[PDB]
Structure formats: C-alpha cells, structure tokens
C-alpha cells in the first residue's frame, strides 16, 4: 500500500554527484595510468560488475587505492564515471571504441549494449 | 550531446538498498531511543537536510554513532529510512502523525508535503 515519489532516485543521484564534486566522503582513488579519480565505493559497486566483485572481496574492500589494467583509457573511464553519477553518457565518434572497451572491462552491460548498437548503425 | 539511460538512477538506488540489507560499507548507526539503524552517510545526506548538515560538520562527519532527539519515533524513522533507499513511503492512518513529525525533524520537505495533503483530506 506504499506511495512513491517519482523523482526521488534522480534527486539521490544528483546529491551523490554533488558529494563527488566536493570530494565529500569519497573513500577510494581509481588509478588509470597517469590519472586519478576519487569516488564512493558504494556508487562504483552499484554501477559496475567489476567494482561489485572487487569491493565484496574481504581484502580489497579495505583498499584506498585501486589500479586498473594499463590498457584502460583514462578518458573512457572518466566518461563512464560521469555516467555512473548522472545517468548521462557522453558517447562520441572519437571516443566510442574506448568507452565500449572500458564498459566491457567494468562490466556495465547497458553501456556495452548501446555502444554495440551505435557501432552497428555506422557499418 | 549526451544520451541518457532512463532506469539508471532507480537501478543505482536498488543496489544501494541491497548494500544496506547485507550491511556492506555502512559507516553509521542511527540510534532512535532503544532502536539502532545502520546506514550509509552519503545516502542519509542525499535524502535529508538534517543529515546533510550533520555529516558536513568537520567533527560530526567522523562519528560512527548519531543519537536522534528522544521525541523521535523509531517506527517513523524506519519508514523514512526505507523511503530514502527505495522511493516508497509506507504512509498509513496509524503512522502518518509520527511520519510527518520525523520528516519535519529530518528536513525531508517532499514527505512533509504529502503528509500535510493526506491529513488535510481527512479533516
């Protein structure tokens, strides 16, 4: 018999992104080659099969720094991290290959799906 | 020029609620009289003006335990905590007064709004 507030989930995510911009309660640094990205472990787990696996691990859950595979593109990661916190994906001709490869590595199935559909339309 | 995934914010919130149920990465206990509620500080801040104020405070931000005013009803808090993590509000005739008073204390304006409208319709 519950009632539901339609905009609640979007409002929560907007405030989680505000916390990220202000660097409040961030508990991990993701290192992608020469670049660093601060984030909330809970948000990363909620969006990515890879981070969900990493942060449920009894040893890795306590790490303050996570280094990604050297093949991962920093811009691709940045675009996906922005997507995690906003639901918006900056998908462009110049970045689609890097975004799709990063999404496959991060196990973000909906992003992989759309990257596949956008590439198929161009061939 | 971004594209947007409609269900993303709802999917994030569902996984944050799964983390709460499994007690993963919870970093605070909210004490309401004889009852205890584990939660994520980031979610509490994202939903409540009161917790936003508390956890941006340079001293309170590091506390693992927060005690609420003894006038706060544990059931009212439980209903609001469930709302924070799901967008669903279990608003009933028997609990509406406690829910509205708790929402005013927690500074959850949209919940206060609806409680006011539901009481006005019954008078």
């Amino acid at each position: 018999s519950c009632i539901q507030f339609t905009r609640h989930a979007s409002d929560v995510l907007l405030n989680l992104n505000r916390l990220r911009s202000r660097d409040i309660l961030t508990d991990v640094v993701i290192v992608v080659s020469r670049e660093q990205f601060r984030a909330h472990k809970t948000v990363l787990m909620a969006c990515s099969g890879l981070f969900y696996s990493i942060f449920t691990d009894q040893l890795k859950c306590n790490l303050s720094v996570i280094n990604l595979d050297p093949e991962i593109n920093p811009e691709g990661f940045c675009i996906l991290l922005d997507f995690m916190y906003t639901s918006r994906l900056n998908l462009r001709e110049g970045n689609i290959m890097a975004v799709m490869a990063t999404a496959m590595y991060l196990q973000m199935e909906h992003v992989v799906d759309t990257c596949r559909k956008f590439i198929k339309a161009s061939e | 020029s971004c594209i947007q995934f409609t269900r993303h914010a709802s999917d994030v919130l569902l996984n944050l609620n799964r983390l709460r149920s499994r007690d993963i990465l919870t970093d605070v206990v909210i004490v309401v009289s004889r009852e205890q509620f584990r939660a994520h500080k980031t979610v509490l801040m994202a939903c409540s003006g009161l917790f936003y104020s508390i956890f941006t405070d340079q001293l309170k931000c590091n506390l693992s335990v927060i005690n609420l005013d003894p006038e706060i009803n544990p059931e009212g808090f439980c209903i609001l905590l469930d709302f924070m993590y799901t967008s669903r509000l279990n608003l009933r005739e028997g609990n509406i007064m406690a829910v509205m008073a708790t929402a005013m204390y927690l500074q959850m304006e949209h919940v206060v709004d609806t409680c006011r409208k539901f009481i006005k319709a019954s008078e």
Binding site: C2, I3, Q4, F5, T6 | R88, L89, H110, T114
Partner: peptide, 4 residues
C-alpha cells in the same frame, strides 16, 4: 507522488 504516485500509486506504484
């Protein structure tokens, strides 16, 4: 607010 809606009936879900």
């Amino acid at each position: 607010w809606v009936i879900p």
